[PDB]
Design a protein around this ligand. Structure first.
Ligand SMILES: COC(=O)/C=C/c1ccc(O)c(OC)c1
Ligand SMILES: COC(=O)/C=C/c1ccc(O)c(OC)c1
Ligand SMILES: [Cl-]
Lengths: 345, 346
């Protein structure tokens, strides 16, 4: 009958509510609509209730974060009751379905780092750009301390606000550091779209010639490959491998979360970076690949086949299959939690 | 005709387009909708094209920032083509109509500060809160320097993301500091709501959050000059009423106060008789600033104008600014911040 308002609700909005069994109760006032649906997992038709309102209770929804839409007369729009997130190439509603007994991505009373917005003009794209830079707890007070850096990228249809919002990255990293499971580190989150209008080679040039120099001159970093990592989800995973594998002198740790390498002579990929497997293994401290067990087959296969080629070649790596999750943010929160614990050790 | 895609459009979205005369062409794919409207100043009915997109060209829209909505069958929602902003008590679409020959809120090749997110847990509300804090360009370079602080508040139906987003505050402040028109300063932007933990513009709980939590936190975590001659509070609409309520009842902590389309409502006994003695009061306060758009709804315009008149009747020194041609909308507040910041800490 009555549940708990989702944590993604706008302040003051009672609905949607999460009921027992993780069913979700949606309501909306729409007296003149012909049809009202909610698309969460599948599409559900709402039914008319009192005072022009419509409502529906869904089937159980899998735990985690989900983009969703309300459909008015078949038009997919943001639910006025929920926060929005930049995903699926627009501002989309999202809903959080809590995991029982899991709290690593939740806020805790531990020392907190700070996410900073840094603006810069790109001479590659000829546009103003923006990075978000997480500094770990104590950064401002520990002026003699220098830190390793993780460059962390969002997926297709997302932007630089993804990891701070959908990814809950500050809680994940703050909590790992506070528990002694990860080293204090700076995390840099930029935009995976870069078009050079004078012509992804453009994104690589932005990272190598603009973002890395910006972070290394504005923050107290340990500016060497043994203290520099790159990872991303989906498209950002393909970009992390493209950029790191063609700039291996700058990175010793690389991660792809539901993304990474499009596979011919696999031994020649990235300009012969791993033509000699034993030498490549000596140069890289970590290669990490993950995928949800419930991802769409085409997305699962691309990443799994990359892993399979690494296994065949003897390229050392960590491979994680996230049980019960799909091409959605819980898979990526779990991946960051695992990956960050392995970094800079 | 030739149109310019608005800067608030999602990347890749051609519409909405700004046409000559600042008319706006809106378009949405909705083949099975019964009615599609756009609410921008007033409601316009859009008209369905053969293939199921609906379109309308508005009347000329006044320059500045505007919240807007698409209505499908009377349901107000976000336009899929635009960015969203927290305003009108939800996530709402916004559109930017550029001003000819004005660039103080645009990004320039000047030294840039940073806006950072700081989290803190409030004992008053028993909830996690967050502030956005602007630090000026040489903050990390000049560790022997400390800075004055402006506490800057959003309006009703908004939140702490308002000044960084709708308000373009980092461009405004970066540019003023770079040109030598404002002193280097820290700006703290928090949330104007403080809900009682047992729940299910005067707010004693919000005052306690600022006085007992936000100000001490900022003075401890940042290199501030922690005294009233280097502490200011201002806000727009609801936040302007809050700035006056909090500053006037904690005058030993603030010497500069601003209300942008806010501050208002006998008069001589307001804020526990703070201005009983006007001559002493004028010597205690270094700046009182009030602004209003000339085109604001009458109840809002007259509220601020009447507050100004009461100051004129009492002999209370202040700056009063009318923003020409703008209403109860963000361009009024960008102009107000630009003026107020130039006056601070002098
Ligand atoms: C969970 O959300 C976040 O972490 C936000 C971080 C953030 C930091 C600085 C900004 O100027 C900003 O602008 C909206 C956002
Ligand atoms: C700047 O003034 C404001 O923001 C609002 C003023 C205001 C005035 C009269 C009212 O009856 C009212 O409530 C409907 C509000
Ligand atoms: Cl208000």
């Amino acid at each position: 009958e009555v549940g708990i308002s989702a944590s993604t609700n706008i302040p003051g909005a009672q609905y949607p509510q999460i009921l027992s069994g993780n069913r979700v109760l949606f309501r909306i006032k729409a007296p003149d609509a012909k049809r009202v649906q909610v698309d969460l997992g599948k599409k559900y038709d709402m039914v008319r209730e009192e005072e022009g309102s419509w409502a529906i209770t869904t089937d159980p929804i899998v735990e985690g974060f989900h983009y969703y839409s309300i459909l008015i007369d078949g038009v997919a729009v943001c639910d006025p009751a929920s926060r929005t997130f930049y995903g699926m190439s627009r501002m989309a509603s999202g809903i959080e379905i809590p995991e029982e007994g899991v709290d690593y991505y939740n806020l805790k009373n531990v020392p907190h780092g700070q996410i900073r917005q840094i603006r810069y003009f790109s001479d590659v794209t000829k546009a103003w750009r923006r990075a978000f830079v997480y500094t770990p707890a104590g950064y401002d007070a520990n002026t003699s301390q220098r830190y390793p850096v993780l460059y962390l990228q969002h997926g297709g249809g997302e932007d630089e606000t993804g990891w701070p919002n959908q990814g809950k990255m500050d809680a994940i990293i703050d909590n790992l550091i506070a528990e002694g499971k990860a080293k204090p580190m700076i995390v840099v989150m930029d935009n995976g779209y870069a078009v050079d209008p004078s012509a992804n080679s453009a994104l690589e040039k932005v990272f190598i010639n603009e973002i890395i120099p910006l972070v290394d001159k504005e923050f107290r970093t340990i500016a060497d490959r043994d203290h520099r990592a790159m990872a991303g989800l989906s498209m950002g995973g393909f970009q992390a491998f493209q950029i790191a594998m063609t700039n291996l002198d700058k990175f010793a740790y690389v991660g792809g979360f539901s993304g990474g390498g499009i596979i011919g002579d696999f031994s020649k990929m990235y300009n012969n970076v791993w033509s000699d497997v034993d030498t490549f293994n000596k140069r890289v401290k970590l290669i990490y690949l993950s995928i949800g067990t419930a991802e769409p087959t085409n997305m699962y296969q691309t990443v799994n086949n990359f892993h399979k080629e690494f296994e065949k070649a003897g390229i050392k790596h960590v491979y994680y299959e996230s049980p019960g999750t799909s091409h959605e943010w819980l898979t990526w929160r779990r991946s960051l939690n695992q990956f960050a614990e392995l970094l800079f050790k």
